[PDB]
Amino acid sequence: EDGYDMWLRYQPIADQTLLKTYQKQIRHLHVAGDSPTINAAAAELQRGLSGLLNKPIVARDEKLKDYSLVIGTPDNSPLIASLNLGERLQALGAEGYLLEQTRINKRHVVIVAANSDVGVLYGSFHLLRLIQTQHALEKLSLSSAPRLQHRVVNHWDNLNRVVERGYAGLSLWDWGSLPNYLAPRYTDYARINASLGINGTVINNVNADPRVLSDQFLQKIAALADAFRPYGIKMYLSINFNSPRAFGDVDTADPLDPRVQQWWKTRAQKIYSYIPDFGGFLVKADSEGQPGPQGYGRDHAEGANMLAAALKPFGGVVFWRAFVYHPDIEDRFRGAYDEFMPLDGKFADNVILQIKNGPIDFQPREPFSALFAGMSRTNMMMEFQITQEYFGFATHLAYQGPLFEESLKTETHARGEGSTIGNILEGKVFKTRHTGMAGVINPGTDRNWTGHPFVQSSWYAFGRMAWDHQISAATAADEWLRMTFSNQPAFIEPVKQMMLVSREAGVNYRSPLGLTHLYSQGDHYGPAPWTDDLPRADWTAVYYHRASKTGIGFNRTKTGSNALAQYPEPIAKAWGDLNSVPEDLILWFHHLSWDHRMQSGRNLWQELVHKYYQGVEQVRAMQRTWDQQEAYVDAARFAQVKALLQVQEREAVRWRNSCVLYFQSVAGRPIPANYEQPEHDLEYYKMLARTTYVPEPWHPASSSRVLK
Amino acid sequence: EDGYDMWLRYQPIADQTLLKTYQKQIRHLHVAGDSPTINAAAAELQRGLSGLLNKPIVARDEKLKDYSLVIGTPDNSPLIASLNLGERLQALGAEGYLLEQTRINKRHVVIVAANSDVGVLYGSFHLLRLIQTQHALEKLSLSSAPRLQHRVVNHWDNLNRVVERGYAGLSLWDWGSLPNYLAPRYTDYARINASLGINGTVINNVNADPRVLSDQFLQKIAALADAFRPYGIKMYLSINFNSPRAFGDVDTADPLDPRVQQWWKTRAQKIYSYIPDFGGFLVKADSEGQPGPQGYGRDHAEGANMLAAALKPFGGVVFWRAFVYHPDIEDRFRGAYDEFMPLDGKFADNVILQIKNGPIDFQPREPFSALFAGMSRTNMMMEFQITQEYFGFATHLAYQGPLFEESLKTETHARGEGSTIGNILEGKVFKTRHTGMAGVINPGTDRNWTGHPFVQSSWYAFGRMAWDHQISAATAADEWLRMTFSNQPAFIEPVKQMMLVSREAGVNYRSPLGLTHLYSQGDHYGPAPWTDDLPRADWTAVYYHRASKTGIGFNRTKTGSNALAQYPEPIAKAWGDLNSVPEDLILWFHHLSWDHRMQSGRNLWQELVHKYYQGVEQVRAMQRTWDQQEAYVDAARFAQVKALLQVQEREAVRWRNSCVLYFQSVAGRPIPANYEQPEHDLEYYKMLARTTYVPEPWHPASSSRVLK
Ligand SMILES: O[C@@H]1[C@@H](O)[C@H](O[C@@H]2CO[C@@H](O)[C@H](O)[C@H]2O)OC[C@H]1O
Ligand SMILES: O[C@@H]1[C@@H](O)[C@H](O[C@@H]2CO[C@@H](O)[C@H](O)[C@H]2O)OC[C@H]1O
Ligand SMILES: [Co+2]
Ligand SMILES: [Co+2]
Ligand SMILES: [Co+2]
Ligand SMILES: [Co+2]
Ligand SMILES: [Co+2]
Ligand SMILES: [Co+2]
Ligand SMILES: [Co+2]
Ligand SMILES: [Co+2]
């Protein structure tokens, strides 16, 4: 096992009693349809059922035999049509499906029914997953339909093939051999994402390269689009707003100038001639030096709508990112809400505002982005991070399921109780036209796609939740572990719990209690809570925690930046009262004295030390847990994960010592004697921050020759 | 087939008659020894014999059975010792072996015998190779010893894991998980190289990063050395001559300063404490802005000897590169010879001068480096390039076997007939102590290690030629094709001839007739024969061709730069007379009028055009040849090579058109009417040079957003 198949491991069911049962149930595979998508479904079932059931199952269009798996839509399979499923099937829409043990013409059969061909494909993947996870097919009757419209992944890939915040190798897209070489991996990539119901992908960096819109690259991209099409995945591209000028065709990119409007209309026509079902554009504009409307004195609705008007005739959409924040504002936290609230209602119907789960930047824990509960007349979608920019690259084990679950189940009170983030995204709260979530996966050419094996679990969790936002981190992990490693109960429970605690461990050894943004800038690998004196203050560490001799935290109540007033009243009330604010968010909103007593009985200095030390202990416990699993995992992946956990323990100790000693130097309070005193002093950890290798090809820190 | 196994494909022998014969001859594997090296040999024979013979062959130490493969040395295998091989074994030295079908106490055996364990390992790989190439074991009696001491590969890997002139992915060395994670791939890398007899590797960029000498990185590198050691491969490191300054320990790097001498001796001690059999140092100094002794007003002997004094007590050596040339000389061709000739005999016995095959920079054809025939009191070694910096990156098929053979069989007349480069390298011509050959392979994390499947053939040939410098390109291709693809004679012949013509095709469409250095600067992917006006002229294209309305070529005779006088008399004569100079080198030494008549009857302009058009035709012929092999090759690799050849044809045409149109614009002569006239003009090809994607992560050109 080298991880190439990820969770699509079609190995014979290990439980022999169960294997026999499946073997009696699925003896033939009946597929009448022959469209590309149906063919892809048949091909997956054929390879999947043959592997899992350890016998040759070939997809065939023949007279129905007893004990068959029959797939199709009423339109492409007369057998499925004969069941007259009616309303039951129809309610499942354009992507849903029904899996049911039933009878046709007296024959025993298990049907993968749907209204569309992509519905059959999704249904087929679920059929396989049931087997992969050793669920019973007897009396099977289940239907499912996705709860969000655009379920997409994002790749921050540069055209040179280096991935920004990419810890799993070079970009998968081999531009030098495209379009001529349709590599097998492009199809496997499609199969991975289709297996989760992911129906779209942005293959290029948001720090966007204009070349993607030239003929040279559109031919390459079209070949990728072709490979992805039979698997229901639409192609999207990140665009550079200054494209008209980069191509030398117009002396401005002002969205109100007719020549600019025409440039993009003509370019959309060119794109659509290459990729007739192109999904549309992802846009990072007027943020971190990236070009945008405000550079021409226009607003984000004006810029987005101009792009949207160009794509509208072709059915394309603009995913316009809300990750915007000007250096001059008093509180970065407030930024996005204050930028976009005045524009609510001004965006065209095929513009969707793509918002990170939190107001800052993918930190281990952030409160929900206020825009989610505030924008009532604009299409929204979520942006989550899978690649571990802030969770330890490819060396740290960190299942992100819980982060996503936490976010999606957060009650916002936008329109009273029941206004969870998930319900907002689905369109149940504010009535909206387009819904979705995007996941920044940043996989690469490493054999196992994600570098660290467990980053696969995050990918998985993300994909499952995009399909159904109420799926728990626990459910997703159970499924993933069974598909990826083993169906042994003794293995699943400990390793699932290990996965479930990994995120919190990553909070604890880095920045607990509402602390945030304590990373080495700008690589983000290691600790650097002392960071100051950067061109922009809101990229430093001290800006956020505002530690002094008397206290720590950032005042976001009515007496401070009043960011709490950007939230619905019940959240503002709960978070602004020291009696009710969750301790896991406290320092985001309150500047508190070191003597403040926490729920545990410890003072805030004590509780900070306790959490940092807890994070390291949690990693050490993960080590012990993983070591007890050697009998259930293959030798190669076992050794790799064991080794990576050793690296993570070493770094978590470095994180703990660096942060505790730094905050000690400011607070001037001792570390309690029941905690192991750090091996060295604060200057040594500063030196370690300057010299400890940063393991990412992209960030310049990896080339740093600093040795002192 | 995804190329991960390279030429060590242990699939069952297809010829059933042959298979039975091998199955009757090798029924058991007898191994008495148990050292790490013998264990690795035994492991290789076990996996190899089992796969090739399609039956379980397990290494055992037991009472000898009839029809056994018996391996060992007289010291570790009583059975081998009982044969009293004597003088037969003595002639094999420290790395040689004997392969022989014989008898031990009545029992039919085949022995792999040597004086050392590594000799047994090398012999074990040859035994496998015999079987892999379907050679008969009956009456087998052969011996072999390497002809060069230091057979190494070079990795231009940066510590961020980007490879300089790297077309095959990221660096193999995963510094973020080292030393903790001993990846299986590290062992497979060792197996690949040991299979060829390669006993050394320089893992880091010659543009050297001083971090490799820090404890942080030495701990990581030692884990690599540990993995490489049982395979007989020693560890070497490129060094930065300014390291004492970079570490902040001394205020100069002057080699005559006692503090600097002491810094390197103390650092050597540190290195050997981690790696007790460390091979030594590779050094790029006073070249292309890299630091060196001349930066302190010292010479290369003074610099090299100071490093050599530090390594001497530990047995280490210094590979000092002669790739040096300063911008204000009249003729870069003369550079290295004028730099090093005055230092002949001034280098310590553990310094070896590492010299490129030619005096410029790995161009598709270069005459031999004059230093090989001139230095008589200095250890020398060859530097060859495998990675296709100048042969089309990972998209062009360019077997380098013929280049290496051409070089190694070149008569220099240094000391009579038989003064071939190969014979000089062996130490027979000048009587030197330390000999070798280095190969710049630059593989990466791509699944097939080399990107383009055929780059594996060039690595293969290099290693075989490092073992025996008289091995032909034809022989190495025959072996490689059989090991990599098929033993079918109808496949071997045409694909072997295709491989053999590929180098020459790459000369023809780029720079035939002694033209050189016509590449886009400084990425090197595409044509740019117009290149001028760079910070230094010797990095441009016009500097070399000197094309004008009246002629082309560079005068290196007595009436020009007189670089020919740097060669032995007979060579200068032959190359300096228009009657005897090879046409494949003519423009290196002579500036000729466009009306000069060539051997073919064509004038020089006509011949120029003919060659450029010939190169494209040769690529088209390679396409047709490869299409005829579909029945013999697995579908995946077949499709991949088919597609790459399409990219190569497109590029070859771009090269042909760009060059023919450029030289036409200078010469003012028509392209003869029988040739397909390019439809676009020269300005268009200049535009394509600015905008055609450069497929390499490392060079900045791949990030170029130029669109016009
Ligand atoms: O969210 C912000 C990040 O975008 C920022 O990342 C920066 C990207 O550009 C790099 O050149 C910088 O080094 C790096 O800091 O980091 C700060 C964070 O607030
Ligand atoms: O041999 C010379 C090369 O070394 C040179 O390659 C240069 C390497 O440094 C890069 O930064 C430059 O861009 C590149 O030109 O090119 C010319 C060749 O003569
Ligand atoms: Co894995
Ligand atoms: Co980059
Ligand atoms: Co645990
Ligand atoms: Co206290
Ligand atoms: Co290959
Ligand atoms: Co680099
Ligand atoms: Co041919
Ligand atoms: Co003419």
mmCIF file of C-alpha atoms and ligand atoms in Angstrom, chain A residues 603 605-606 669, ligand 6:
data_model
loop_
_atom_site.group_PDB
_atom_site.id
_atom_site.type_symbol
_atom_site.label_atom_id
_atom_site.label_comp_id
_atom_site.label_asym_id
_atom_site.label_seq_id
_atom_site.Cartn_x
_atom_site.Cartn_y
_atom_site.Cartn_z
ATOM 1 C CA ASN A 603 -5.867 31.556 36.283
ATOM 2 C CA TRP A 605 -1.673 32.235 32.724
ATOM 3 C CA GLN A 606 -2.017 28.783 34.245
ATOM 4 C CA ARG A 669 5.074 34.471 35.615
HETATM 5 CO CO CO C 6 0.454 32.760 37.997
#
